[model samples]
Target: PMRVFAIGNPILDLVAEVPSSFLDEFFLKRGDATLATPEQMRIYSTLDQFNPTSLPGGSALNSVRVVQKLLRKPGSAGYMGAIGDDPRGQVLKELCDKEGLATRFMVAPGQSTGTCAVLINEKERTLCTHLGACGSFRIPEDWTTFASGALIFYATAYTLTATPKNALEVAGYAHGIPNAIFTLNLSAPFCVELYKDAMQSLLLHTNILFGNEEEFAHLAKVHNLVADKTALSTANKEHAVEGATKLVVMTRGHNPVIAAEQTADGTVVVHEVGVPVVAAEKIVDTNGAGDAFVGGFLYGLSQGKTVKQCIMCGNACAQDVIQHVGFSL
Candidate 1:
């Protein structure tokens, strides 16, 4: 039976070593995430010339892969998302099956699967995403049947960008279940800034929240959790706990991870765990490091490990992921 279940967009990650000129050719800025326009869709086809490596990817799906890998048990983790009836979709499905991940993927007829181009230039990755069929996912009325044994529900902010109603439905379902744990990730700063109201609504049902320093800063700024918008510190994290979240975990690249927990009796407890240093020469790609961290943290939670132990597991997984490409186990 599944213990961790998640819903998100399913994208095929195409990673390629490209020159800065390649990005400029597509009018893409370094380190920016863009939804592919009709003209921009050619970028996916263009990536083929660079011999890009394709793998199954998406924010929440990446995290689920982490949990499933750690658990090492088939059906221990389940994923729900949409894909198309194309070769890319078939490739993505095959990879998920190879990984032994239990998936409930909706096949959209006459549509193409989503694809994310991870264009690497001098260690900085530029993302160009074509959500495609994944952008129009609808929750099946019978999801309760497949999600039956899932006690912990995780969804990324990206889901809200496309399907806020479905995200809300899952959050509401999790909230109504006794002893259920609902978690969310601020997948991107733009996701938080664009969907502040949706984020607030989901936070009402969220037990744990995950974000990077930048996403947390934006969240704090938009939610009025901080006075100084330019400053980045635990002050924003602490103020965020005043909301409905019981736990907030913020990851700072190569720095200690900060966690704030709202204890019973209205007390906020904070913990900082040092991240193990990875040598610069050994770093391959930085994509999916945070997703891997959430996977490790959720794995620890599923195993009933202590909070510190959970964070340590997260740090360990993240370190491992950055050394590889595309969330590979």
Candidate 2:
């Protein structure tokens, strides 16, 4: 029904303004993403003593938002996710509506919307999400029917971790389509540690893949798949990869992004391209830089751009978002 159908859990970001002492107390570091258990979630609940503000959030949603903004195509981007049947859900929906992103939601009643709490101060910001209704989110009964015609179907690992049924359907649906491309993001390193097996199966059906150094490295290690360095160098230039498992894009903060693709017969092409190291002279928080890259890269891919061009596009988008003040939410 669209070009990019983003299916995952919706998150409302809550920025908590607290002291450095508070961060130190929790043994947290700046620019780190953690999965909050109910206990850690409770810790933030008491942080009302410090001022906190909420904003729309979600890993896949962030990418969709950027895709919608960069593409600016009418009905180009659609997002489907689970949210509470409450005001917070309304806020996220309106935020996307304002940005012109198409929305499809699985609304759970009597549940607070999923939230990613950002502990921010002058020097650092740490994130941990309390996925409320996200836990029980199931794909809509007609999700397959709704998502079938998309040229690009994108989802993050967090969604699969929250609901394996959704991941199964996502992978199955992509394989079901003859021409549609399925995209997946590694999301966080921890999720990498946990869902290695699930990712392995999904990668077979994935057309365009996204991840960071840590997560991809772990994936490489888990699969015992060694990237042939010399072959990668030789195949770095633009070429046609006309099949599934086409591209694997790995990004490193302040370093070059590594992308590899396999052609129909079995030739593997790889590229290592440097990003704008000093896009704005100073790179502050490196939070959503990966998501931003996905946004730009996906747009370029959808436009039939070369591999190098796509990486450069993603690099430019990452530079723009990373230069923003505070964390790259």
Candidate 3:
């Protein structure tokens, strides 16, 4: 079986359900996912009241764990990232190892592991991330040290930006390998704007592309391609059909998740799948829903499921996460 190699920051998420007033007090916006300043992270690093709700959450890492959980197989996935030698890093490595990910974590002398605070209110999540060790990420000089597999995954543009120049090295090396699938995610709007050039460079090898409606539109403009409703759904329609097996998955909150799949010699087709309905009052947070969805979708794909089935799995996983405070189930 093909292994999964995830390139992502291994983050510890501290989640809490707080009132909107709390954000206002801290000069924070309720919906903005911003990087926390050294002073700002006092809530997570020092506040004893907000401790104890930590979860192992990172975009690509979370998805990989989902795949491993669904498959219940060790050695099914491998991951690489920079971390610290502190207690947090030790816990992170041990926790993920127990989760079945073949972790190749590097320790940077004195820095701390990365952390993101997730505040939930009215069923939405806002993040205050502290990119401690991950921001200094760099690719190992040895090519053999690169995470390897038949498929590679990474996301959260900041995680990619953590090692901007070296991220290219990782993407380029993977793309150069024959039949290797390189998966990429637009992550957030800032990721699209800050690293548009590198994003475009890696798109050439992105067999399975993940983005939301806004990110997709940005990706289209970045490539000087059409930005129509079905532009990306059909842009690689031919490739999906005859050129190579390629996929573009774009999601819209409360709207149908759209997917384009081209099977060899078959008609290129796009499927619009509905997000599984949950009671409006039951939806608690949207923190890791997308990554959960990606996890489910990738797991299904690795199992050779049909495009529709894969998306359904995606929807299933997404539904589970949105019902909770975080995306760990």
Candidate 4:
């Protein structure tokens, strides 16, 4: 049985090492993610100069890949997403298959598969995505083929931006299943800013919420929770109360992680999990750190670890990611 099932964009990540000036040339900000405009899409063809490495990518997809690695069980992790009937889509399917993930990806006719250029300059990674076929994703009528026996379900906020109806369908199914856990990641600030209503509806069915400080701050501001962006405890507490989520985890880079849990009697309990410090010279890339953390936390949850342990596991997983280039486990 598949222990984890995820629905998200299935993207081909073109990772390359480039000088800081490269981002300026493309008008991209350092350490930010944004959907690509037509001009920005041109960046994909020019990547050959940097000898880019292609990897399977997407937020929830990254997490489940980690779970598949940790579990080391065939068919333990399953995934659903839309892809094009193109070579890039074929590459993503083969890559995930090689990683032992059971995937049921819908092929969108006459559309190109999505791609993200992960521009790395030292420790900062800037992402420019062309959603392509994934942007028009719809939950297929035959989705139930891989929808059984998954105790945990996860999706990123990017899904809401692409197709809220599909995200809602998957979230609703997870909510209906007894003892099932549905997790959501507030992917980026732009997603919250643009798809606020869709995110709010998904939150009603989210069992656990994952996000970093910047994303949380945006959500708090949009939801009118508070103005203090740095006060993650209060922000997490408020979000836990407002949504159907029982646990709210806020990750702060290089600082302690804050986790707020809603108790049975209606009180909120906050826990702080410290991050392990790594030497500046040893850090290779910071591209998928947040996704790695979610993967570890979910692994811990599957193992029935305590919240603190789960956070610790999350930090440990992130440490491994920043020490390498890309999301390879």
Candidate 5:
């Protein structure tokens, strides 16, 4: 049986270090914010004076790559999606081969391969993505080929919106299979806003849900307490965990993780896994930290470890990734 089967776009990520002044010049809101305006684009162009580096990245792809690295196991991860028949697509294919991930459906002859440009400032990142050939990936006739004997992991809102009918087809196929666990990483706040219906339907089929504090609040539709402040407030935590079937796992950076699972009698049990305080002396970048955590967490789950142990392993992988320049082992 395949340990993890991930379905989503696999794009090359380009990371650029821009000056603080670049945000101001481009009319972009500073401090880990995303820009979606012509004014922001103009400013981004102005910031081209700064240096940038390109690397292989796509949210789910990054997670599975990290899983392959930290787990040190063979035939653990497989990817399913479309890429262009261009040079960039070739590069992506080569990278996947090097990482030892099972590439059963990394098809070409679609749109050009997708790309995301990440603007980094003071260790924080804001993303601008272009979905090229990635938009052409429809649900394959043999999607079950990828789903058979596998744990299904999904990420990115594009899977829901870009080709929703196909996305639902894939999810429905996975749901019908016995012993298949579905895990979803809510991609972003805007994704939740845009694809609420699709996301809700997908979550109903999910056995494991992963998200950061902000993303969880939006998905659960509660607004009284913020993510950071909610942790110590047991009432707030209980409220958040209520009715969330399967397991609800929330991550707060440098803080404890909040987890909840439903008992046989329908009681919700909540537990907090504390973050280890050990610090890295030199922090280069914090991009893809959450994805790295998911990689380790899934690896532990595949090994049949407890969720508590998975959380600890996840925290350790996240710490190690942030200390490096890019999302590399």
Candidate 6:
């Protein structure tokens, strides 16, 4: 049986460096900081030349890739998403093939492949994306063929918004299979804003949930006035996890991870997984750190490690990724 079969968009990430001043200017012009427009990309292109790197990315894609990297034994990891027939798509498929992931559901037939243009200012990143072909993916008629006997995982608000009907169908199919676990990642703030009710319904069937501090707060509908405060407030995190029947994992940058799961008696048990501090000098790119953490957590779960151990593995993977550039092993 496949340990995890991730379903969502598969994107090629183009990481580029821009001046910190340029980033501030771009955000100010956009009003809303999220979802950079075409003009913003053009503006970024005209800025000072910095290093650029390409890697296989997309929330679920990153998770599965990291899971495959951390797994102790051979087990199937399948990705169900679409890309274009273009060169970027070809590169993504080839990368998956090389990584030993099952590519049976990676279809290519729509617009050109999706690419996220990450603008790195200092070390923080602001993403400007062109979803392109990824927006046209529909759940295959034989969706069960990919999900059956597999632990199903999905990320991104786009998965729910782009095709809500098909997304529900896929989740239902995954829920019906025996021994199958469904996991979800709250993709972004806008996704949370748009699909609050749908997310609540889906959580009932999700066995595992992952999200960063900001995304989790948005999903749970908590409003914190202080921008500097952690989004994973004790009360809010507990409240959010209580809605789910299974486990909830929340990560806060540079702080400890909080995990909550329902016990046999229906009481919620919460655990705080601490991070071993590494020097600031060792830190590199922070992109995909959360995705890598999910991957390591799932890998530990597959190995029958305790919850604590799983979080430890997750922390280790995230720590390692932050010390490197781009999302590569």
Q: Name the candidate that leads on lDDT.
A: 1
Candidate 1 runs further than 4 Å off: 18-33, 46-51, 121-126, 225-245, 284-287
- lDDT, model 6, position 171: 60
Please report the TM-score between candidate 3 and the true structure. Answer: 0.85
Question: Which residue pairs show backbone clashes in model 6?
Answer: none
The C-alpha lDDT values of all candidates are 0.78, 0.69, 0.68, 0.77, 0.65, 0.66
lDDT of 6: 0.66
lDDT preference between candidates 1 and 3, better one: 1
For 289-312, candidate 4 gives per-residue lDDT tens digits of 788888888877777757788888
Ranking by lDDT: 1, 4, 2, 3, 6, 5
User: What is the per-residue lDDT of model 6 for residues 1-329, given as tens digits with 9 covering 90 to 100?
Assistant: 37777777887777777666765776633212245576665643443246666677777788777887775334467777878776777877777777777645445665666676666655656666666567666777886776566654554455875766555666677666565666677777877787766766676656777776777777656333333223343344344432224666777777778776567676656767878957685664444778788788777766674666877787878788766666867
Instruction: Find the 10 residues in a row with the least total lDDT in model 6.
Output: 222-231
Which portions of model 5 miss their true places by more than 4 Å? 16-53, 105-110, 118-128, 222-245, 280-287
- Report the C-alpha lDDT of model 5 over 1-329, residue by residue, as the tens digit: 36787777777766787666654555544444442454543443443345665667677778787777765665677777778876667777776777777755455664556565567766666666556567666767886766567754555555664766655666577667655666777677777776776765666666677767776767555335444434522323343221224665678666788776566686656756878746654453444778877888778877775767877787877778776656866
> 4 or 6: which has the higher TM-score?
4
lDDT of 2 by residue, 80-165 (tens): 88888867688778876777778688788787666766787663668776776766668887887665567778888787677566
> Relative to the unseen true structure, what is the C-alpha lDDT of residue 23 in candidate 1, on a scale of 0 to 100?
85
TM-score order of candidates, best first? 1, 4, 3, 2, 6, 5
Q: Which window of ten consecutive residues has the lowest lDDT sum in model 2?
A: 230-239
Which ranges of candidate 6 are over 4 A from the true structure?
16-36, 39-53, 72-75, 104-110, 118-127, 222-245, 284-287
Clashing pairs in 4: none
